[PDB]
Design a protein around this ligand. Structure first.
Ligand SMILES: [Mg+2]
Ligand SMILES: [Mg+2]
Ligand SMILES: [Mg+2]
Ligand SMILES: [Mg+2]
Ligand SMILES: [Mg+2]
Ligand SMILES: [Mg+2]
Ligand SMILES: [Mg+2]
Ligand SMILES: [Mg+2]
Ligand SMILES: [Mg+2]
Ligand SMILES: [Mg+2]
Ligand SMILES: [Mg+2]
Ligand SMILES: [Mg+2]
Ligand SMILES: [Mg+2]
Ligand SMILES: [Mg+2]
Ligand SMILES: [Mg+2]
Ligand SMILES: [Mg+2]
Ligand SMILES: [Mg+2]
Ligand SMILES: [Mg+2]
Ligand SMILES: [Mg+2]
Ligand SMILES: [Mg+2]
Ligand SMILES: [Mg+2]
Ligand SMILES: [Mg+2]
Ligand SMILES: [Mg+2]
Ligand SMILES: [Mg+2]
Ligand SMILES: [Zn+2]
Lengths: 135, 175, 136, 130, 102, 38, 94
RNA sequence: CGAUGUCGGCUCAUCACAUCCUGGGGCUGAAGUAGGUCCCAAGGGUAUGGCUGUUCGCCAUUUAAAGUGGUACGCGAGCUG
RNA sequence: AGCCAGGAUGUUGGCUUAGAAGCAGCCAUCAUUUAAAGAAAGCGUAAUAGCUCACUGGUCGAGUCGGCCUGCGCGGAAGA
């Protein structure tokens, strides 16, 4: 029920500008989500986006369970760049490697619905290829 | 054709009386009599009605399908009947019933007073909603259409008499 | 607007336009716009159809014009009597007999060629049809 | 699908029923994508992708396929009862997993016949190798 | 702006008729340029068609003048600029033989 | 209503109907697509 | 393999060929070799369906005329100028 | 061609509908007001002046509107000239 | 054809933008769980959010679909 994922990098407490009214459409407050978010980000490093499920239940007591950091920012850390690629196929921005890709896919295995991590490594391979990153 | 294939079952306590092209169906709700086109052959088979073309009639099957649908609606009407639910939208709009006359306040300078036919009975659970019940599907649809024609739902706010099931597409005044 | 660069004579007899055409097979492209009807296409009409089909195919593939307007058509100016010599050449036409392949096209899919030829045929005075290369 | 692809699919199910002895049944009248994804993840984390949820239980598709072996499954065709084969191991534990699947928010449409692989009854057999 | 060729023709009788067939025939052509305000009336020929052609040329020519008085008023404005330059409060001041500042 | 000699389906939801010997296009989605041959 | 049933034309010429094409047939001729040419009439629809295939003009064809198989190849086809129709076909004995 | 008198005005019209107004209606880039466009519709109605011989046109001021055409560009054995 | 469900993961693809998250535009237009799902066909927003669609499976249970050639009709079609 209204389980919607719209947040930013954890480094910003009370991320009012980027998200704003969407996080406060219903009778939900702005403070409860931020306090839960920081409560979780105590246990991880700061600065990364973190997706969370949000059941806005009637008694004003929401159930939230979080996921892994986005593979987008994770492959951004892997490429050590900020901008991925524009007009990708004409000009190659950077080059990326299968084994470290497998290192990427092994750690996020628990959250992703994949048993053979080779499939998810092909998935992240295609993701990087579109991202402008030929492996 | 394919509609005419399916026989119309007559439940318990539904007196069917075929006479040439005139069929009188009678149920707990009421009685409905309807004459069919000459091109239709209708026969009652011990619990059911079946329809087909008469030989020498070009549009036999289409007429038969129409007859099958009409008689099936007659069956449904005499057993449980049909109901249409209108519900007014807009400030100041309301409806009331006085026996068999719906009094409508739809933003007019005069009272709108819709008389009903014999078979249709109306009621208003609220001021906004009009639920009307009847045996004949065509008559109830026609009365609902008349009421909705009193004030057709506008496109800019959906204001007007609307069918509850109806979705009123809303337009925006672009500035 | 096609027009002969030079002509050996400046004016031409009315003539007649009986008979079936000669360029009947698709010869250069893969698809063709064939004339079912009979008549004369002006240079303006040929240009208009060519523009429509070129724009429809997005300047992709290749298009042949298999008819060329080489018959000059004269008109007398408004408010002039019936004698006093032949009128001035105003435009050029190609006589079209039933069966004439008017335009050909390839390098495009068959459906795109059909769509382009439909838009082009809307600009022509004669009735047309869609044809394809036939082996033999 | 033209007849050839249907023939490969029927050969596939015949091969799978030949290869694997045990199986389970499921009917998704109010089978949610969540429970379906969980039954897929169950098969995946236990073993390879061979395990499927294939809904090929027609009166002329699975009923045509079964006369090879497990002819007793021919009667099951009516009323949309699906299958989930299980190749390796003697009497794997995924029979009861559908019992929990029906327990947790399903209208009870599968009715858990169990197809009597050991020629048992329809009622659950909680006894399995451990 | 080059106002579009949207001429509109109205063909009527001619002024200063001189004759029965003239009194009765409608041969003068009054042309009007829409979104301009230019209305001419050509009747300097025996027939409608010559007047209509002359009217096309004359609409062209009257827009050509409208252009000419427009550009000529711009000419006049540009010279008048040469007489309205106050040789005082400078917007900007440059010094020396090499314009050394701003 | 568009009254035309050439009435066509303008989208998916346009439907050709012959009513009282007149070809008409009735569109549930778009009232602008309502057409009547004439 | 394409097998084309044919009849020997009773009469020949312009009017006769018009009459065949009106009666949903069309003329054709088998020539080639030392045998004299054979003028045949063919059912138009059958042969139109056959020649829709591209191999109609490549493979060897069998014309059955008077209960006699003749091996040919389609040498040339006369098409109606603006209709999907066949006017005449040349077969060369194969 | 042993004569079918022209323009305009006046008087008196009559018909058509491709409708200016009034009437009905669809769509609208139709909130309302006011519009735009199309469809139906010919019952009735549908300016006075200044200038010019004018028709027209421009202008002034009206009007619900100041329709478009046919009628020997209706109408001189009806008038004017 | 109607009827029941899914229509997801990478991903909210990166930019330039004021913001762009399928739907402002440019390009790539791929890969994964695969009965099936387009870096998105349409609708929806400030951007989201959100509703259909593609496809797919389920029920029903005999025809169905659109191209071609053709006969005869229909609209297009207003005047004193
Ligand atoms: Mg000659
Ligand atoms: Mg020639
Ligand atoms: Mg003189
Ligand atoms: Mg004259
Ligand atoms: Mg009617
Ligand atoms: Mg019209
Ligand atoms: Mg002859
Ligand atoms: Mg005379
Ligand atoms: Mg006389
Ligand atoms: Mg009208
Ligand atoms: Mg209107
Ligand atoms: Mg009148
Ligand atoms: Mg009248
Ligand atoms: Mg009348
Ligand atoms: Mg009356
Ligand atoms: Mg006249
Ligand atoms: Mg007169
Ligand atoms: Mg008059
Ligand atoms: Mg008189
Ligand atoms: Mg007079
Ligand atoms: Mg007289
Ligand atoms: Mg005088
Ligand atoms: Mg279906
Ligand atoms: Mg017609
Ligand atoms: Zn539409």
């Amino acid at each position: 029920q209204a389980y919607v994922k719209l947040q930013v990098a954890a480094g910003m407490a009370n991320p009012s500008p980027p998200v704003g009214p969407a996080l406060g459409q219903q009778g939900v407050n702005i403070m409860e989500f931020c306090k839960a978010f920081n409560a979780k980000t105590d246990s991880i490093e700061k600065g990364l986006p973190i997706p969370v499920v949000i059941t806005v239940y009637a008694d004003r007591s929401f159930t939230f369970v979080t996921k892994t950091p986005p593979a987008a920012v994770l492959l951004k850390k892997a490429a050590g760049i900020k901008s991925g690629s524009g007009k990708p196929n004409k000009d190659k921005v950077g080059k990326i490697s299968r084994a470290q890709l497998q290192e990427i896919a092994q750690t996020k295995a628990a959250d992703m619905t994949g048993a053979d991590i080779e499939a998810m490594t092909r998935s992240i391979e295609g993701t990087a290829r579109s991202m402008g990153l030929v492996v | 054709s394919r509609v005419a294939k399916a026989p119309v079952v007559v439940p318990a306590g539904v007196d069917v009386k075929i006479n040439g092209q005139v069929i009188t169906i009678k149920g707990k709700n009421g009685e409905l009599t309807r004459t069919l086109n000459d091109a239709v052959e209708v026969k009652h088979a011990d619990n059911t009605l079946t329809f087909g073309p008469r030989d020498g009639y070009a549009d036999g099957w289409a007429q038969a399908g129409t007859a099958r649908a009409l008689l099936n609606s007659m069956v449904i009407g005499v057993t449980e009947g049909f109901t249409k639910k209108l519900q007014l939208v807009g400030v100041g709009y309301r409806a009331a019933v006085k026996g068999n006359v719906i009094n409508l306040s739809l933003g007019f300078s005069h009272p709108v007073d819709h008389q009903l036919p014999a078979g249709i009975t109306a009621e208003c659970p609220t001021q906004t909603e009009i639920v009307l019940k009847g045996a004949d599907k065509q008559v109830i649809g026609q009365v609902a259409a008349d009421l909705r024609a009193y004030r057709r739902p506008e496109p800019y706010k959906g204001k007007g008499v609307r069918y509850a099931d109806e979705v009123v597409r809303t337009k925006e005044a672009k500035k | 607007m096609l027009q002969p660069k030079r002509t050996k004579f400046r004016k031409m007899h009315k003539g007649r336009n009986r008979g079936l055409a000669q360029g009947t097979d698709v010869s250069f492209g893969s698809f063709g716009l064939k004339a079912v009807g009979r008549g004369r296409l002006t240079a303006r009409q040929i240009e208009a159809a060519r523009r429509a089909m070129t724009r429809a195919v997005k300047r992709q593939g290749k298009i042949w014009i298999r008819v060329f307007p080489d018959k000059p058509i004269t008109e007398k100016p408004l408010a002039v009597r019936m004698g006093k010599g032949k009128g001035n050449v105003e435009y050029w036409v190609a006589l079209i007999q039933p069966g004439k392949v008017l335009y050909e096209m390839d390098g495009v899919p068959e459906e795109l060629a059909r769509e382009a030829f439909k838009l082009a045929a809307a600009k022509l005075p004669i009735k047309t049809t869609f044809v394809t290369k036939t082996v033999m | 699908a033209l007849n050839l692809q249907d023939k490969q699919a029927i050969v596939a199910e015949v091969s799978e029923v030949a290869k694997g002895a045990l199986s389970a049944v499921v009917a998704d009248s109010r089978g949610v994508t969540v429970d379906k994804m969980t039954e897929l993840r169950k098969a995946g984390r236990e073993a390879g992708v061979y395990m499927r949820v294939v809904r090929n239980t027609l009166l002329r598709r699975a009923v045509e396929g079964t006369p090879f072996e497990c002819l007793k499954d021919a009667f099951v065709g009516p009323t949309l009862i699906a299958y989930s084969m299980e190749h390796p191991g003697a009497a794997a534990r995924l029979f009861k997993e559908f019992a929990k699947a029906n327990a947790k928010f399903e209208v009870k449409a599968a009715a858990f016949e169990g197809e009597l692989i050991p020629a048992s009854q329809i009622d659950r057999l909680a006894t399995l190798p451990t | 702006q080059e106002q579009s060729d949207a001429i509109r023709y109205e063909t009527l009788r001619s002024s200063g008729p001189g004759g029965q067939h003239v009194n009765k025939t409608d041969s003068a052509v009054r042309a009007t340029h829409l979104a301009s305000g230019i209305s001419v009336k050509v009747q300097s020929e025996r027939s409608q068609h010559a007047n209509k052609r002359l009217a096309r040329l004359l609409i062209a020519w009257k827009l050509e003048q409208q252009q000419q008085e427009n550009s000529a008023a711009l000419k006049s404005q540009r010279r008048m600029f040469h007489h309205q330059i106050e040789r005082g409060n400078p917007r900007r001041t440059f010094t020396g033989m090499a314009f050394i500042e701003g | 209503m568009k009254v035309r000699a050439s009435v066509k389906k303008l989208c998916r939801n346009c439907k050709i109907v012959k009513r009282d010997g007149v070809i008409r296009v009735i569109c549930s989605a778009e009232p602008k697509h309502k057409q009547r041959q004439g | 393999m394409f097998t084309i049933n044919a009849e020997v034309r009773k009469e020949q010429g312009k009017g006769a060929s018009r009459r065949l094409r009106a009666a949903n047939k069309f003329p054709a001729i088998i020539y080639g070799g030392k045998e004299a040419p054979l003028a045949i009439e063919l059912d138009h629809d059958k042969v139109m369906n056959m020649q829709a295939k591209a191999e109609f003009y490549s493979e060897v064809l069998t014309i059955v005329v008077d209960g006699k198989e003749i091996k040919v190849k389609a040498q040339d086809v006369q098409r109606h100028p603006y209709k999907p129709k066949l006017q005449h076909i040349d077969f060369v004995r194969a």
